[PDB]
């Protein structure tokens, strides 16, 4: 019965004008969206973007494509999409995106007897996500995907999440090592520009950075170097070579840790939480060496045990205060 | 009434010659430009370029496309653009640019009954921006986008900013961490080449680098190392191991800071402000060690307290002078 199906489809496309939306000049065409999230491959702080792979499905009725006498849904080769009207959907905050092309264009067209068109695409998109790194790496980010009609206003087209809160599937599949997905939300609104009002759908995720890596890699070495710096205060004040060596070397160790670290992050003009911590730790170890200079300055140069004894208590206590204030402010 | 609209549009394009501009052989076609700045994604000192995303709209009248008996503006599928004349607009200082293509070519065509064509594109461009880094990182840059007709002279085409000072929107949207947009300006002029005079529109931005990151990351460590170097002058002159160790280690710390730093910047042949500062700080810490050599040279080897006492005052005072001159010259 392949000649009959071929005839029916040929008839559908005979005189079909791709230039005109369904119901041109009439009420807007309602387009239902449905996303299946395959993956979020990457999240980049330095590039302020993320990479998403998804199955993007669009659902609308085109009465020009209605067919009778066939009680099936016709799955057609993806090349038929070039002979049909499709919505002019784009991702307003995308940086670079493509439809996968192996072994064929990852595209689907399914027609229904009533003229419903189910148009599916498999898309990888790099999309902008401005991040607030003031609390980094104890930060929570809101990365969105903004879906809009490019040229058709709300007079001509309308979007909705098909299935409401179930329109987006596969959020459980997202496996980012550095983030957990706390929540996702679906929004619908109209956005006004100089050229008119346009339909908008917004998918957003709340990403929460896992602290564990940073505690061990950046925070703990810093804490141990700062504590190490305090050993000087228990060393004899006559051991000038030993105590000056300890002060300098710890300072220089703190510089090597800092500079190495800075190859991992974007060139932001503001203070991250980690920058504030490392700057605090640097100041502590610097003051520990300066403490010896004061002891050195008056013992030989002009109580000495008293100044050391105060340092033995005041430095760890101040570091405890510093940590308390820091971790309360940021956690 | 879709057959009537289809007929009208078919009639418009019947015998339409894309090769000939509107009013060929007559007065120039006036093309109004209008930009909506979506984002400035990146600014690169090393590549001397920036990346802009915008909605680029062109506005002109083509009397060949005038239609009667339809009191609507026709929004057409973007593929109709291939059957129309459009201006041969290009970005003279662009390095790499593309029209976004997902899910369709991010392109709009809107016709008006009087033959006005509204042609919109969503473009991402990497565009050249020669930067003067003599004051880096206290610098102000002028990055431009130069818009020109490729092949049509001012005999054949003319550009204007449609809306004057409102032709460019979305400057408030630009969120570059490392820069603030101080100002934008719109210019119109004619540019003469060997092949004739061409219309030009220029959009420029004044970018001001935020100092905050650099004070903390590069300036403050340098200041603290230089101050640290001075501790030597308060140490006993008999503590040869201690004082020589302090001098060298600080020098070596200053080298590690310098070399790490240099992976962030372009290979410019001139002195940035930060290069001048780091070179000054290196000289200070180097002179502090050489100061000890002089003390060392005459105490043992051949007043000693006098030379140290002068160093205790002259070095911090000279560094204060150095900083005063530096920060006045550059701020």
């Amino acid at each position, epitope marked *: 019965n392949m000649s009959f199906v071929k005839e029916t489809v040929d008839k559908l496309l005979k005189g079909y004008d791709i230039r005109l939306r369904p119901d041109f000049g009439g009420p807007p065409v309602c387009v239902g969206m449905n996303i299946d999230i395959a993956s979020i491959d990457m999240v980049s702080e330095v590039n302020m973007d993320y990479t998403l792979t998804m199955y993007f499905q669009q659902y609308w009725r085109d009465k020009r494509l209605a067919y009778s006498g066939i009680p099936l849904n016709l799955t057609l080769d993806n090349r038929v999409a070039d002979q049909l009207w499709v919505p002019d959907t784009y991702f307003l905050n995308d940086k670079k995106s493509f439809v996968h092309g192996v072994t064929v264009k990852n595209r689907m067209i399914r027609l229904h007897p009533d003229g419903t068109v189910l148009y599916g695409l498999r898309i990888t998109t790099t999309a902008a996500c401005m991040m607030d790194l003031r609390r980094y790496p104890l930060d929570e980010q809101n990365c969105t995907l903004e879906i809009e009609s490019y040229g058709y206003t709300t007079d001509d087209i309308e979007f909705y999440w098909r299935g409401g809160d179930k329109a987006v599937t596969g959020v459980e599949r997202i496996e980012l090592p550095q983030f957990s997905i706390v929540e996702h939300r679906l929004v619908s609104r109209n956005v006004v520009f100089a050229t008119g009002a346009y339909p908008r759908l917004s998918l957003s995720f709340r990403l929460k950075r896992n602290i564990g890596y940073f505690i061990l890699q950046t925070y703990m070495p810093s804490i141990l170097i700062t504590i190490l710096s305090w050993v000087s205060f228990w060393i004899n004040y006559d051991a000038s070579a030993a105590r000056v060596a300890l002060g300098i070397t710890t300072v220089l160790t703190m510089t090597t840790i800092n500079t190495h670290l800075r190859e991992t992050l974007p060139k932001i003009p503001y203070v991250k939480a980690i920058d504030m911590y490392l700057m605090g730790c640097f100041v502590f170890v610097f003051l520990a060496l300066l403490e010896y200079a004061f002891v050195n300055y008056i013992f030989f140069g002009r109580d000495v045990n008293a100044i050391d004894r105060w340092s033995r208590i005041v430095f760890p206590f101040t570091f405890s205060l510093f940590n308390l204030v820091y971790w309360l402010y940021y956690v | 009434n879709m057959s009537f609209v289809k007929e009208t549009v078919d009639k418009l394009l019947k015998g339409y010659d894309i090769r000939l501009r509107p009013d060929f052989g007559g007065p120039p076609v006036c093309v109004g430009m209008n930009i909506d700045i979506a984002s400035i994604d990146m600014v690169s000192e090393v590549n001397m370029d920036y990346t802009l995303t915008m909605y680029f709209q062109q506005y002109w009248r083509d009397k060949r496309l005038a239609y009667s008996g339809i009191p609507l503006n026709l929004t057409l599928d973007n593929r109709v653009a291939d059957q129309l004349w459009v201006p041969d607009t290009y970005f003279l200082n662009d390095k790499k640019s593309f029209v976004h293509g997902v899910t369709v070519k991010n392109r709009m065509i809107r016709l008006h009954p009087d033959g006005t064509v509204l042609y919109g594109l969503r473009i991402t461009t990497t565009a050249a921006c020669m930067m003067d880094l003599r004051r880096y990182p206290l610098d102000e840059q002028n990055c431009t986008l130069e818009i020109e007709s490729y092949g049509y002279t001012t005999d054949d085409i003319e550009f204007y900013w449609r809306g004057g000072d409102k032709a460019v929107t979305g*400057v408030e949207r630009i969120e570059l961490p490392q820069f603030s947009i101080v100002e934008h300006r719109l210019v119109s002029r004619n540019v003469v080449f060997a092949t004739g005079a061409y219309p030009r529109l220029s959009l420029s931005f004044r970018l001001k680098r935020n100092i905050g990151y650099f004070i903390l990351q590069t300036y403050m460590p340098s200041i603290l190392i230089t101050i640290l170097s001075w501790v030597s002058f308060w140490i006993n002159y008999d503590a040869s191991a201690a004082r020589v160790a302090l001098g060298i280690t600080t020098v070596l710390t200053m080298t590690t800071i310098n070399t790490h730093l240099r992976e962030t910047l372009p290979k410019i042949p001139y002195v940035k402000a930060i290069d001048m500062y780091l070179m000054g700080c290196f000289v200070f810490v180097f002179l502090a060690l050489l100061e000890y050599a002089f003390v060392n040279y005459i105490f043992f080897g051949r007043d000693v307290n006098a030379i140290d006492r002068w160093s205790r005052i002259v070095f911090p005072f000279t560094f204060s002078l150095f900083n005063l001159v530096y920060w006045l010259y550059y701020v």
Partner: nanobody
Amino acid sequence: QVQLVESGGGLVQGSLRLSCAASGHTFNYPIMGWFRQAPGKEREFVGAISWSGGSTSYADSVKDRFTISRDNAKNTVYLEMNNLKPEDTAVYYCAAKGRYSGGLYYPTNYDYWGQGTQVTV
């Protein structure tokens, strides 16, 4: 989730300083707009400021008359209403705009509306 409290609506004929104090997720809503509602008339754009950068724009009526700026420390925006006129007699409202929420001028693009200081002159 943004909360906006506005204050400093006095009476003049003169220079005035409206203030607009924000709290909550202000990062997601980088733009603050000033509107004003005269009795009867539609809500009308006055000006807008980006939190980050202070990129400013004004309606013609208030161009070179009013001046907006901010301080990110307090999360506060101010409309410095200099050279006042009897046309400038309205309920001035503050509002927050999302990053991708459209044109500055259109009040339907804005989500979180301040109370609205009445100002008469």
